Amino acid sequence: PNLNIVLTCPECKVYPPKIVERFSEGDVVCALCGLVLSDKLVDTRSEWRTFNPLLDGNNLSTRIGKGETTDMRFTKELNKAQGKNVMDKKDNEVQAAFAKITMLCDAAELPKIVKDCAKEAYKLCHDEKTLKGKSMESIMA
Amino acid sequence: PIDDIVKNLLKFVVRGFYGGSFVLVLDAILFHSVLAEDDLKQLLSINKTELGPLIARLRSDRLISIHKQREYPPNSKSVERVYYYVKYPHAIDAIKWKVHQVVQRLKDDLDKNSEPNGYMCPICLTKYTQLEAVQLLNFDRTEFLCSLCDEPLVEDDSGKKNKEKQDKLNRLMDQIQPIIDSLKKIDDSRI
Amino acid sequence: MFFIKDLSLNITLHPSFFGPRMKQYLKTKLLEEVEGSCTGKFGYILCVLDYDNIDIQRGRILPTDGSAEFNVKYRAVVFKPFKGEVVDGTVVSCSQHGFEVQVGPMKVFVTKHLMPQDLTFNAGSNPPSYQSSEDVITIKSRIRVKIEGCISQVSSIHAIGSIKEDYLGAI
Amino acid sequence: AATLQLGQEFQLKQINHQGEEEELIALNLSEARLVIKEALVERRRAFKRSQKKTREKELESIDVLLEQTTGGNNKDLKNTMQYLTNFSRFRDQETVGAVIQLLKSTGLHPFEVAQLGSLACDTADEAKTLIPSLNNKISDDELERILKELSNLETLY
Amino acid sequence: ENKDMCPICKTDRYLSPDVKFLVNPECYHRICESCVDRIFSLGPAQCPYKGCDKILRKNKFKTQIFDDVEVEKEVDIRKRVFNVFNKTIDDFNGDLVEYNKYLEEVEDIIYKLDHGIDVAKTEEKLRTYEELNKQLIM
Ligand SMILES: [Zn+2]
Numbered sequence: 001p002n003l004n005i006v007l008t009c010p011e012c013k014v015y016p017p018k019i020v021e022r023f024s025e026g027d028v029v030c031a032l033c034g035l036v037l038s039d040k041l042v043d044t045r046s047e048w049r050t051f052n053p054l055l056d057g058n059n060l061s062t063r064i065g066k067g068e069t070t071d072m073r074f075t076k077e078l079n080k081a082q083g084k085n086v087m088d089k090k091d092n093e094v095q096a097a098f099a100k101i102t103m104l105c106d107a108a109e110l111p112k113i114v115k116d117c118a119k120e121a122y123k124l125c126h127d128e129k130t131l132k133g134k135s136m137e138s139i140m141a
Numbered sequence: 142p143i144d145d146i147v148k149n150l151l152k153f154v155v156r157g158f159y160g161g162s163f164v165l166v167l168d169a170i171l172f173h174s175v176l177a178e179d180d181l182k183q184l185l186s187i188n189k190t191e192l193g194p195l196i197a198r199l200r201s202d203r204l205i206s207i208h209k210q211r212e213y214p215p216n217s218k219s220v221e222r223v224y225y226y227v228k229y230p231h232a233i234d235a236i237k238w239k240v241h242q243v244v245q246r247l248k249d250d251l252d253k254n255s256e257p258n259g260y261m262c263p264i265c266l267t268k269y270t271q272l273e274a275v276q277l278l279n280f281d282r283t284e285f286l287c288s289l290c291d292e293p294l295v296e297d298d299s300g301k302k303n304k305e306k307q308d309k310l311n312r313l314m315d316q317i318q319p320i321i322d323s324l325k326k327i328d329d330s331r332i
Numbered sequence: 333m334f335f336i337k338d339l340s341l342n343i344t345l346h347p348s349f350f351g352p353r354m355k356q357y358l359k360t361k362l363l364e365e366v367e368g369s370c371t372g373k374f375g376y377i378l379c380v381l382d383y384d385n386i387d388i389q390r391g392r393i394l395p396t397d398g399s400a401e402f403n404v405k406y407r408a409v410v411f412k413p414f415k416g417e418v419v420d421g422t423v424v425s426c427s428q429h430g431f432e433v434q435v436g437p438m439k440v441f442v443t444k445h446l447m448p449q450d451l452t453f454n455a456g457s458n459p460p461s462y463q464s465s466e467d468v469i470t471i472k473s474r475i476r477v478k479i480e481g482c483i484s485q486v487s488s489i490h491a492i493g494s495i496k497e498d499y500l501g502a503i
Numbered sequence: 504a505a506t507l508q509l510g511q512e513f514q515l516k517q518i519n520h521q522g523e524e525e526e527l528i529a530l531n532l533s534e535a536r537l538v539i540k541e542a543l544v545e546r547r548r549a550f551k552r553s554q555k556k557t558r559e560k561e562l563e564s565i566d567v568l569l570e571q572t573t574g575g576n577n578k579d580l581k582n583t584m585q586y587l588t589n590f591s592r593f594r595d596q597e598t599v600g601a602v603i604q605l606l607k608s609t610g611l612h613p614f615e616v617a618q619l620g621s622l623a624c625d626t627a628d629e630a631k632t633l634i635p636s637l638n639n640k641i642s643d644d645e646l647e648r649i650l651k652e653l654s655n656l657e658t659l660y
Numbered sequence: 661e662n663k664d665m666c667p668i669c670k671t672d673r674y675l676s677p678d679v680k681f682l683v684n685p686e687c688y689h690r691i692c693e694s695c696v697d698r699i700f701s702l703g704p705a706q707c708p709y710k711g712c713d714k715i716l717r718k719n720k721f722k723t724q725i726f727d728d729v730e731v732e733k734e735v736d737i738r739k740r741v742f743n744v745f746n747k748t749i750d751d752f753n754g755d756l757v758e759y760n761k762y763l764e765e766v767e768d769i770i771y772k773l774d775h776g777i778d779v780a781k782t783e784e785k786l787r788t789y790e791e792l793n794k795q796l797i798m
Pocket residue numbers: 009010011012013030032033034035
């Protein structure tokens with residue numbers, strides 16, 4: 001398949017392209033021959049402003065909660081239902097541990113940086129017969 | 142009695158394509174026509190986790206169906222006893238149907254591997270066929286390219302796999318022979 | 333199989349040629365763009381007939397591009413291949429798996445895995461050719477092919493046949 | 504396929520541009536080839552009307568005479584004619600008409616009868632295997648004799 | 661019969677013997693439709709009749725069902741003799757003794773062909789049948 005697109009000015013083709021991108025006009029232009037290579041360039045700016053990807057990755061779960069158009073019988077029905085599928089992943093320790101370190105570093109006033117930095121360490125190993133458990137706390141602290 | 146051969150056949154398949162524990166419950170159900178639920182329970186002297194699906198498998202196998210053998214409780218109640226009605230007519234319905242299903246399936250596997258006709262590009266990991274090959278065949282390219290990756294094609298379903306399916310068939314014919322022979326011996330009377 | 337058929341077409345006459353002799357231009361465009369072309373739905377096109385009498389009724393002008401376009405219903409000569417019928421042809425090309433035969437304008441290919449057993453490829457032939465237990469098939473040899481596989485891509489058809497059964501092979 | 508079920512463009516119910524129905528228009532690779540030059544000569548006659556303001560030797564030049572007439576990117580037309588003339592075994596257009604009077608008197612679908620004409624067929628069994636559809640449609644006795652009548656019409660240049 | 665019916669459905673006497681356990685004219689063994697149809701569809705393939713290697717031919721089979729194939733083959737050999745001697749001169753002059761003698765010769769040709777214990781006239785019978793065919797063709 002090789003699944004690759006690389007711009008190349010057909011009139012020049014002199015090299016891996018020496019081109020520019022007129023973002024305001026939303027195009028790309030051969031800096032020498034001036035031919036517009038591809039047009040209708042698409043913005044990617046305003047998409048993220050509305051918005052853990054570092055550690056867990058593609059293991060997916062969506063935080064949820066009750067709605068306004070919902071009864072008390074609908075409120076605690078969801079709070080009971082939201083926990084009945086937590087078995088599917090073993091990030092539950094992590095989701096408690098990542099919570100726990102989040103409790104840990106913040107409580108003694110560590111900077112928010114350490115929160116992820118400690119998170120980086122735990123997700124790094126997370127499994128070794130050299131650990132094989134190992135009190136579950138050293139892997140935290 | 143031929144019905145015993147039906148039950149004797151039920152042991153063979155429930156011990157041939159099933160485990161050994163699958164026959165002890167089969168023994169227990171066929172031990173008595175109307176058997177109390179607890180009487181079977183005391184026989185095995187184990188939990189229901191190792192008994193439940195066995196009867197459910199037999200009821201799904203249609204060989205025996207748990208019947209509503211109604212019993213009047215002596216405490217001014219109505220609690221029935223779970224006595225299975227051994228469904229011999231449905232036994233040949235279900236068991237033989239699978240045998241007919243698997244034999245044509247293994248027959249399908251035979252001609253799939255019988256001769257390598259379809260092609261494949263290992264680079265793209267996609268299978269192809271002769272009709273794709275010819276429309277992809279070129280005068281200059283004496284082989285078959287793969288326009289997706291621009292790579293030559295290789296054949297699929299070599300001659301070895303045809304033997305494997307046949308050897309599966311030969312084992313299929315041999316291992317199902319006691320099952321069918323005990324099944325076809327029931328075909329005379331359909332009891 | 334060879335046919336003569338009555339077909340409809342839609343020519344788009346660009347405004348540049350809008351002179352009064354566009355009718356002549358229209359008759360001109362049809363011939364040079366069709367004779368020598370193929371269709372998956374109608375096969376190759378060799379010749380167009382009834383030049384004088386073709387429906388040229390009217391031209392609808394497009395919303396944009398201002399290029400008035402016409403609908404032409406015309407009768408021509410075509411070759412349309414199929415499956416399940418025998419076709420006599422000329423061996424032209426060949427590969428390791430079999431040989432390719434000229435059929436009308438189409439270059440039909442024949443593969444060994446449909447060809448008879450006694451026939452096989454013998455690279456010793458120059459040009460390369462296939463020796464059977466009875467004869468041997470060379471380039472100019474007249475070969476009748478029963479087409480068993482044909483795919484009609486739009487404007488192109490390629491056919492796969494066999495010489496397995498009787499009254500076939502070199503003629 | 505061989506069940507007389509091709510694309511609906513090739514049913515018996517064939518429609519001209521004016522909606523009229525008639526049986527499928529099918530020609531053998533000789534009868535079609537015969538119409539090729541004569542129709543093309545008419546165009547070449549019309550080409551010159553607007554301009555005013557063995558058998559192999561005559562084969563190429565006549566086709567070259569018409570290759571020159573049109574664009575010539577249809578040299579396959581010559582190749583088809585090469586495919587045709589090398590494999591067309593008829594002549595004398597009145598031959599086809601009697602053959603049409605003969606073959607179509609049998610009530611055979613024109614593609615089938617043309618395939619009888621188009622294929623250098625001699626025997627009834629020869630058509631039994633070549634044309635699977637035409638094996639028992641007609642009694643095989645008629646097959647050979649008609650083919651022999653065609654084999655009587657072998658014109659070998 | 662009881663247990664010799666097919667490589668697949670061997671115990672087919674009581675196994676609903678409805679499928680054609682036909683015999684290929686060049687194989688001489690019971691082959692069920694579960695087996696034979698797998699074979700002649702692709703062409704001349706051999707069947708695993710207890711590990712047999714004889715070729716089951718193309719769509720050219722014959723009906724032999726439950727007619728003692730070996731004796732039927734001998735009957736077929738007799739039928740082949742009956743076919744070879746379909747136009748044999750036996751009563752062309754009406755002589756019964758000559759026809760009686762002529763009938764013995766044709767049966768002996770079948771007897772030579774259908775025996776196989778020391779079959780050497782069997783090949784000669786085919787040549788004699790070919791000689792008869794030479795007489796029949798000419
Ligand atoms: Zn440039």
